[PDB]
């Protein structure tokens, strides 16, 4: 329809283990850790809150999902997903990578030829940051701003908005935490820094010591307002009932 958002990618893991038809395990290493479909020990809803959980301690993870390729030139790009560190994590990634066409999904590991890297990373109390990394001039450029990530056991929504006028916005739990211009907050005037020829693959390319992190409700769209709606329909419905079930079990 004329007022529909473009939904480039969406994944909520609502249909059992049919997700294995959409996500590709990388074969680069023989001993990657295994992702598992799980809702956890405590949850908002048993079926709705099923996501990909890291099932093994002290392992690299390499899983990716492809979608119909698109370019963000001339329009907004929004990347959204939920991260739940149910384990009370010591050290481990919770970020995504957005790759252009031509990625060997079976060869993905520590891949640097992505367009954008985004999301929480935790490694001891001294590392508790949200990455926002852009590929430009063959260099992966990190944000000059310090964004603090969530460190508890609960589900949190992470949102990156990239606009065609070289502006960005970061939200945690549907609330702005950081905002500005791409020329100012990175070490890159070029009107097309924001723009990439193809997005084709979203990758989970991580190391964790204490595993048990759940990933859910992935959204790549061109609509800010829809991401916010979807965030509330998704993370916003999870939050209260999850806290409630956890509070219960704590006795």
Report, in Å, the least distance between residue 80 CB and Ca ion.
13
61 among annotated binding-site residues? no
Last residue before each gap in the chain (C to N over 2.5 A): 188
Q: Which is nearer to Ca ion, 153 or 216 (CB)?
A: 216
- Answer for which of 11, 216, 223, 228 binds Ca ion (CB under 5 A) is 216
Contact predicate 201/23, CB 8 Å: no
Distance CA 217, CA 152 (A): 19
12 is in an annotated binding site: yes
Q: Is 107 annotated as a binding residue?
A: no
Q: Which of 8, 9, 13, 230 binds Ca ion (CB under 5 A)?
A: 13
| Beta carbons within 8 Å of 3's beta carbon, 6+ residues apart | none
CB of 198 to Ca ion, least distance (A): 27
Cβ of residue 52: shortest distance to Ca ion, in angstroms?
Answer: 9
Q: CA 98 to CA 202: how far, in whole Å?
A: 5
Spatial separation of the C-alpha atoms in residues 161 and 185, rounded to whole Å: 14
x/- site string to Ca ion, residues 33 to 72, per CB under 5 A? Answer: -----------------x----------------------
Residues 6+ away with beta carbon under 8 Å from 18: none
Residues annotated within a binding site for an alpha-D-glucoside: 95, 97, 114, 121, 205
Binding site for Ca ion (CB under 5 A): 12-13, 50, 216
């Amino acid at each position: 329809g004329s007022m529909d958002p473009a939904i480039y990618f969406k994944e909520q893991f609502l249909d059992g283990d049919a997700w294995t038809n959409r996500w590709v395990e990388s074969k680069h290493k023989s001993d990657f850790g295994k992702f598992v479909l799980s809702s956890g020990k405590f949850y908002g809803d048993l079926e709705k809150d099923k996501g990909l959980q890291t099932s093994q301690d002290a392992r690299f993870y390499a899983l990716s999902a492809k979608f119909e390729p698109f370019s963000n030139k001339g329009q907004t790009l929004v990347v959204q997903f939920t991260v739940k560190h149910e384990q009370n994590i010591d050290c481990g990634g919770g970020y995504v990578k957005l790759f252009p066409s031509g990625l060997d999904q079976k060869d993905m590991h520590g891949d640097s030829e992505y367009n954008i890297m985004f999301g929480p990373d935790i490694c001891g109390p001294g590392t508790k940051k949200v990455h926002v990394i852009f590929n430009y001039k063959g260099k992966n450029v990190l944000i000059n701003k310090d964004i603090r990530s969530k460190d508890d056991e609960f589900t949190h929504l992470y949102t990156l908005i990239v606009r065609p006028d070289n502006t960005y916005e970061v939200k945690i739990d549907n609330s702005q935490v950081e905002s500005g211009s791409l020329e100012d907050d990175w070490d890159f005037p070029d009107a097309n820094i924001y723009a990439y020829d193809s997005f084709a693959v979203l990758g989970l390319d991580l190391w964790q010591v204490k595993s048990g992190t759940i990933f859910d409700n992935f959204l790549i769209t061109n609509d800010e307002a829809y991401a916010e709606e979807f965030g509330n329909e998704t993370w916003g419905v999870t939050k209260a009932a999850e806290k409630q079930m956890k509070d219960k079990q704590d006795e």
